[PDB]
Write a structure and sequence with these properties.
Radius of gyration of chain A: 56 Å
Oligomer: 2 chains of a larger assembly
Number of strands of chain A: 23
CATH architecture of the largest domain in chain A: 3-Layer(aba) Sandwich
Structural class of chain A: alpha/beta
Largest sheet of chain A: 8 strands, mixed
Bound molecules: a molecule of 2 linked components (NAG-NAG), the ligand C[C@@H](N[C@H]1CCN(c2ccc(CC(=O)O)cc2)C1)c1cccc2ccccc12, tryptophan, 2-acetamido-2-deoxy-beta-D-glucopyranose, calcium ion
Largest interface: A-B, 71 and 69 residues
CATH superfamily of the largest domain in chain A: Response regulator
Shape of chain A: rod-shaped
CATH topology of the largest domain in chain A: Rossmann fold
Distance between the termini of chain A: 148 Å
Number of helices of chain A: 25
Chain lengths: ~800, ~800
């Protein structure tokens, strides 16, 4: 009773089966103008038939063993679901036919069989729908393929168990693979069912913690219409993201792949979930230029030893218990069995045709089917061997094996721990789950046959700690089926050393602009968020990748200018010392004795101090040299001017008594200098505001009226000396001294007046060189005006140094005779 | 047959119904050490019993009316689901017991046949019931299930609903958040088929409008202590104040109880429709946490005899309602004697106890139940009045009302269009849905008894054009129950003008810092992502809000410096004209023909030209003053130098010829200036790179070689005349003028060497000043020591003293 096409065999204990022998149903959703009929399954699935044969082979192998359930046989009733909720519910209503009559008091045939457990429901929505109806009657349901996390809820799904791991490790592993290859710009596609939606939600939650930006997220279906598919295609080809993560199955993904292949969209990196990473619907050679280089997940393979020889024994006339063998024979050989295609014989050979039935290389879901059947058999064997007094039920009492009920088998399945043929331990946890490792594979092209080869490139170990679970061998991956270069999948290129990041408005964090830093700031590492302002006495490059030290500007002792000015100063000091020496040697003579013999000594000492006071303007301006820069020249030159002015002419008649005048004339300068240095002294000053890349060192004078008073006092005494010596230029005594005094005063005023435009233009820039040159020029002019004339008669023409020449000049000059050479 | 507690009446045509009379089932763990019993239902639900009474009132009203299905009765079988999939699945297997026997080909043979089911409340229960009812094409009309996943007609073939689905609601929450200008919110969903698509649609709509979501959590009714503690810790670690909740009342009650136990105040709760009017959550003792909630409600309908029917209920007079006895026990808190808690009597008054049964303002879900029943009956009436030859079936054939089948009822339900008691039109679309408006409520506190009052503060109009659907009256909102101020729920504070948003690493784009703008760039808006560049002739102000105009710089008139230079030039022109006038006055005295008096006229005219040539430097250069700046002074000063050098000693004997030897040395310079002006003319220039804040206006010379030749010829002529006047400085003829020529050339060379460091140092306004001052000083010195001694001799010294 129930569906017609089935696999059935009698026994003492009956198991139920649910497998997708067809991929789907015929699209015939029309109005109800006639009474509705049964739908028609459309596309044959050879892999599902192999799964059904795995369950049949496991049952036969259990029934031949004397060590597992002796003297009682197992039977089966297996139906087709066609990947559809409605066919599975039609089969499940016949699974619970005995139990439902008792609950509804409906009463009658009294010869209907009871199933104790159900193996089946590949797809997760089909699994949830079957689990809802089976959990009413506490019938256990072991699934070989459904991996949704929503079926781990034991409040709603009381009797559901799995031989496959659930999909949360897979989503975490997908995030880990994206993190390993250093991408941050991806798109996601999931199937709109109970399988794709929670997996892609877990992947989104994991990708948010690892700073991965997701651009698009779309949903697809097997029964999607055309305009939805073109909306998804325009969403895909409007993005610059290359990596697409797909959580779907084969028949749910086929129309989108067909539309993408038709439009020739190339260069995408597909990350596949386990449900389509080995599908024969997607892995076609004609699709390769779109789907080459896919990276995907696989489960761990197992060995069922005599299974291939069992698969090679199928026949339509010999399989009396398998009602699916006839259509399998017709779809393999494209023929028709009697009772337009030609008539089948039974002589045809399975090895001649290439379908996924016997052309596989690893058993993964088939091993899960085998493990499910053996789990149920080991729970039954635990029932059979249990000793009175040590059971799992009330008082420690044992179930009866000849009247066994389904809830007792479910209770024994919750406490199961057995060893399989691989020598590993199979137990289920509190949520009914079962952990396992993952293999990581990559799609290649076969050079010989042209088909698609699945190459193992890594693994995911679930028993390691978080962060150390992934292994990938990068050298074995071909990236679009041909290339050895890891692709670029970021939103924007990396900012370089001279730049920083900038926000683009309305766009996520992974997309940024690269902005040049300003003239004062730098950056050194790659993806900077801000330019660091490096501290004082530093400035950036022209390229802003670092910053370098500023340049300190001042006049030092090692410049050529400094050596030249030092040589001129030392030569002046040597010449003045030479003149003092010849005055000391050739004394007691009328030329020296006529020049008062004591004012000349102090005049030469003043000239020595005025020459040596120009050395404070060269070097680094410190706090104390800036205090003695200006007063040193200010007192030395006024001492020299007073020594010149005291000796000239009848001004001494206006009132030794000569020295007191010099004493007052330099003591006034001494007191104004000491009150200036005690009220507000000058000090050094590091100027950075004039030019950006150069620190000047200059001197701030403090007060300004004190400096004006100093220069005014010196110019006042110079003008008084010039005026009083300007009257007396016609007296031809002492070798015409007053003419040279007026010449020296004129030289002083001309130099310090003509140096005015040089002083105001380059103010703040090395003006101390100008201040050295003016001092040296004035000192040289005064010394050469006063002493060299008398030196020429004293040294090179003696016996003219006589009293008769001082009182009456004999008209012979030094400079004309020296210029005559 | 089936479940024991039921409501049941007989009839010709039988409808089915599913309502939650209890809030859930007893939380017990099955160790499976004995055979499992049936689970027990707990926490009576008075609103659900009112919902069940709506269906019976509708069916009795239809049965008493002669204008709708005459001579034909309706019956019912109604069961309790307890918000659970398994109880509803037992009830649904009781519904389909006739149809399933024929499909399996599998005793009583008098089994009644259900032709339609009034649906469930929650979407998981509706999906599980619809999966089984679609196998037999039995129509199912739900009054409350609003999930989008039930709009898929490939999976759910026979499902209809009188409630709008949740996509408009999830768009409306994002519209509310956009209206109050928030960008930093959190979400909480219930882990079922109701909360997950609602929060997914909200997340997509909020990412469309630049709203950043901080956290996202799932809750349930059966969450334990550690999950609730984790969710409360996730809430308490976040600065987001606005929280959007998509859940029902039973699924949200444990989280709310734990938040109340910790006194977490200050959050802004945004309520979906399932818990926005829930008595489990809207309690006075929770008002310090969930006060001021803004939520959604459906539109209210009117059923004009329904309250009287609700008050006619009785445990011993309702013989078709099995749910009345437990209602009566739970209302009056007693025990009913069958056929401490006191013994109930039959004489109690329903108005004495405040339960949600007759304590309501508006009928919203009850009106949906009423519409579901009337939709089914109007489909049956459309069957009953079909005319032969115009049916909906094959060849235009009509179904038979005495032998009706459920697929024909579903076919007529897909083509239904009728008018209701409120005067609106009821049709279902191709996905089986029905749109409707929303009302927006705010949770206040009553000053009378302390209960929670729902106040209407706006609407959402789904018939309007997108972007114009929301209306909010803000003056009626009390935030947190007491405050009249809109709260702040942004991640970061705003950056003002003169600042730029800077990135914080590892954080979303709604969180940023503020960095000041650079010197040459400006930003006037707030929350500016970058500084904008000022234009070419503009610079930014002191806080970089707007560009101000760049200052221009040149030596100008009405400046004090330019006025002083102009007064000195006018004074020089005046005294040179005085000297010329005195010389033309005494043109017939011996001391004037002592020199060549025709040459001194040319010398004084060239001195006038040399004074007048200095006025071209002052003012703004206008691209023709730059052409006449340098050649005018060049030719005037070489005319002065040649006029001096002709009259010196022993050059005129070398060679009337004086004017020719003037003409050659001025014609050479005229040739140089005219070649320079014809080949590469000077041009004006606006210099901007010297200061980057001021624009200097200068003259680009155009050629340096020609300017070098122009200077060098003048220097050469000055050197030759200096040498030829230096050889004969001791001669006393012409009042010792050779030493004065020597002094004039010495002054010229001293000034033009003294002003050379002022050309390599300063660059702006102050260079034209020194070009005026050097010209003035050189020409003043030349004129002074050439024509002052003779002027003293003629004028101030007596003319009787040595004029012969
Ligand atoms: C993909 O991008 C294209 C290119 O911009 C979009 O096409 C344009 O869309 C705008 C928006 O209304 C229209 O004004 C233009 O007329 C469209 N141009 C063309 C050539 O169609 C397109 O809408 C985008 N699609 C998706 C799904 O985002
Ligand atoms: C693409 O973007 C990622 C994410 O920012 C970059 O990965 C960073 O690379 C730098 C340099 O190697 C590391 O210091 C960071 O730790 C990486 N971040 C993360 C989260 O792993 C990646 O370098 C970018 N790729 C390209 C080609 O620009
Ligand atoms: C919180 O952030 C939002 C941005 O998401 C701000 O809204 C902007 O406000 C400015 C000025 O008030 C408007 O010019 C923009 O058009 C608004 N943008 C949007 C998208 O609405 C909001 O002002 C911020 N709130 C506070 C208190 O700073
Ligand atoms: C919420 O914030 C608290 C406060 O930091 C976190 O508690 C600390 O977590 C760190 C890291 O796990 C521990 O080292 C500390 O001992 C914790 N306690 C304290 C008092 O600092 C808590 O982990 C956060 N929770 C969530 C869900 O974010
Ligand atoms: C949904 O709400 C809108 C606005 O609340 C209703 O439109 C109003 O209809 C009345 C009468 O038809 C008019 O007087 C108002 O001017 C309308 N307002 C606006 C803003 O258009 C609309 O009728 C409601 N729809 C339903 C089905 O009740
Ligand atoms: C070395 C100099 N110091 C600096 C300070 C400003 N400066 C300066 C330059 C030119 C003039 C025009 C003028 O009056 O001829 C006036 C001043 C030069 C100095 C120090 C002390 C006394 C001085 C006495 C007389 C001249 C120089 C003096
Ligand atoms: C008034 C003077 N003007 C000349 C003097 C120096 N000057 C100048 C201008 C620009 C640069 C290059 C730069 O800075 O880009 C260099 C020099 C401009 C003048 C005019 C004509 C003949 C003269 C004969 C003798 C002395 C002066 C003469
Ligand atoms: N995990 C899938 C089922 C599945 C696993 N592997 C497969 C291979 C082929 C087809 C389906 C599958 C689901 O729950 O829906
Ligand atoms: N829409 C809710 C059901 C619902 C609507 N309004 C309600 C009021 C109270 C309880 C439940 C509801 C769901 O699908 O789950
Ligand atoms: C299963 O059995 C093995 C040995 O019999 C034991 O080591 C292991 O812990 C058991 N597993 C569980 C989950 O009890
Ligand atoms: C999982 O993978 C790791 C690493 O390859 C391996 O050591 C471990 O044994 C595997 N686990 C199982 C159960 O096979
Ligand atoms: C900038 O220029 C310098 C030398 O000109 C060079 O060494 C440096 O690498 C450059 N920086 C960048 C980021 O190109
Ligand atoms: C329903 O009937 C009314 C009355 O004629 C009509 O205006 C309206 O368009 C109809 N609606 C549909 C969906 O046919
Ligand atoms: C700029 O800032 C100053 C003080 O910091 C203030 O006086 C002035 O008004 C500001 N200008 C603008 C345009 O805000
Ligand atoms: Ca056996
Ligand atoms: Ca955006
Ligand atoms: Ca009637
Ligand atoms: Ca983050």
């Amino acid at each position: 009773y129930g569906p017609d096409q089935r696999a059935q065999k009698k026994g003492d204990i009956i198991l139920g089966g649910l497998f997708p022998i067809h991929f789907g149903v015929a699209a015939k959703d029309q109005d109800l103008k006639s009474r509705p009929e049964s739908v028609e399954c459309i596309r044959y699935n050879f892999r599902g038939f192999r799964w059904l044969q795995a369950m049949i082979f496991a049952i036969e192998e259990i029934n031949s063993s004397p060590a597992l359930l002796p003297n009682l046989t197992l039977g089966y009733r297996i139906f087709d679901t066609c990947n559809t909720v409605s066919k599975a519910l039609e089969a499940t209503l016949s699974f619970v036919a005995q139990n439902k009559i008792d609950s509804l008091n409906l009463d009658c045939s009294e010869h209907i069989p009871s199933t104790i457990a159900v193996v089946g429901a590949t797809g997760s929505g089909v699994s949830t729908a079957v689990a809802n109806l089976l959990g009413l009657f506490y019938i256990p349901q072991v699934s070989y393929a459904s991996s949704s996390r929503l079926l781990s809820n034991k409040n709603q799904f009381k009797s559901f168990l799995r031989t496959i791991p659930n999909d949360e490790h897979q989503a975490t592993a997908m995030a880990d693979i994206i993190e390993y290859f250093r991408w941050n710009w991806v798109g996601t596609i999931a199937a709109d069912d109970d399988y794709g939606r929670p997996g892609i939600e877990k992947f989104r939650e994991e990708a948010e913690e690892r700073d991965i930006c997701i651009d698009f997220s779309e949903l697809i279906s097997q029964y999607s219409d055309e305009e939805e598919i073109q909306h998804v295609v325009e969403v895909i080809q409007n993005s610059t993201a290359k990596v697409i993560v797909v959580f779907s199955s084969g028949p749910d993904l086929e129309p989108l792949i067909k539309e993408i292949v038709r439009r020739n969209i190339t260069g995408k990196i597909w990350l596949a979930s386990e449900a389509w990473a080995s599908s024969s619907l997607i892995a076609m050679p004609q699709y390769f230029h779109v789907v080459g280089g896919t990276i995907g997940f696989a489960l761990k393979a197992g060995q069922i030893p005599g299974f291939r020889e069992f698969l090679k024994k199928v026949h339509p006339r010999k399989s009396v218990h398998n009602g699916f063998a006839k259509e399998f024979w017709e779809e393999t050989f494209n023929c028709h069995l009697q009772e337009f295609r030609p008539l089948c014989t039974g002589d045809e050979n399975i090895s001649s045709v290439e379908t996924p039935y016997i052309d596989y290389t690893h058993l993964r879901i088939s091993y899960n089917v085998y493990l499910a059947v053996y789990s149920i058999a080991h729970a039954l064997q635990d029932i059979y061997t249990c000793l009175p007094g040590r059971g799992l039920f009330t008082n420690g009492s044992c179930a009866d094996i000849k009247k066994v009920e389904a809830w007792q088998v479910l209770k024994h399945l919750r406490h199961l721990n057995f060893t399989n043929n691989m020598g590993e331990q199979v137990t289920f946890d509190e949520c009914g789950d079962l952990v396992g490792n993952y293999s990581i594979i990559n799609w290649h092209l076969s050079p010989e046959d042209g088909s698609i080869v699945f190459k193992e490139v890594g693994y995911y170990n679930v028993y390691a700690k978080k962060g150390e679970r992934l292994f990938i061998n990068e050298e074995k991956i071909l990236w679009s089926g041909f290339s050895r270069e890891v692709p670029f999948s970021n939103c924007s290129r990396d900012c370089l050393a001279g730049t920083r990041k900038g926000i683009i408005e309305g766009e996520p964090t992974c997309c940024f602009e690269c902005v040049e830093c300003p003239d004062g700031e730098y950056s050194d590492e790659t993806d900077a968020s801000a330019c660091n302002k490096c501290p004082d006495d530093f400035w950036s490059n022209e390229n802003h990748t670092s910053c370098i030290a500023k340049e300190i500007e001042f006049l030092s002792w090692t410049e050529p200018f400094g050596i030249a000015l030092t040589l001129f100063a030392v030569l002046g000091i040597f010449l003045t010392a030479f003149v003092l020496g010849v005055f000391i040697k050739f004394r007691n003579t009328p030329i020296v004795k006529a020049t008062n013999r004591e004012l000349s000594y102090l005049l030469l000492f003043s000239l020595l101090c005025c020459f040596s006071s120009s050395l404070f303007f060269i070097g680094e301006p410190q706090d104390w040299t800036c205090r003695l820069r200006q007063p040193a020249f200010g007192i030395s030159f006024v001492l020299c001017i007073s020594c010149i002015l005291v000796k000239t002419n009848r001004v001494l008649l206006v009132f030794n008594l000569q020295f007191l005048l010099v004493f007052l004339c330099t003591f006034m300068q001494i007191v104004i200098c000491v009150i200036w240095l005690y009220t507000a002294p000058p000090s050094s000053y590091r100027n950075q505001e004039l030019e950006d890349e150069i620190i000047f060192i200059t001197c701030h004078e403090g007060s300004l009226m004190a400096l004006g008073f100093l220069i005014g006092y010196t110019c006042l005494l110079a003008a008084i000396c010039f005026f009083f010596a300007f009257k007396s230029r016609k007296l031809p005594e002492n070798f015409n001294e007053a003419k040279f005094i007026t010449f020296s005063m004129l030289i002083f005023f001309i130099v310090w007046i003509s140096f005015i435009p040089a002083y105001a233009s380059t103010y703040g820039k090395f003006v101390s060189a100008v201040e050295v040159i003016a001092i040296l020029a004035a000192s040289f002019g005064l010394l050469a005006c006063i002493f060299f004339n008398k030196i020429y008669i004293i040294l090179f023409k003696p016996s003219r140094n006589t009293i008769e020449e001082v009182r009456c000049s004999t008209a012979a000059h030094a400079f004309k005779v020296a210029a005559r050479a």
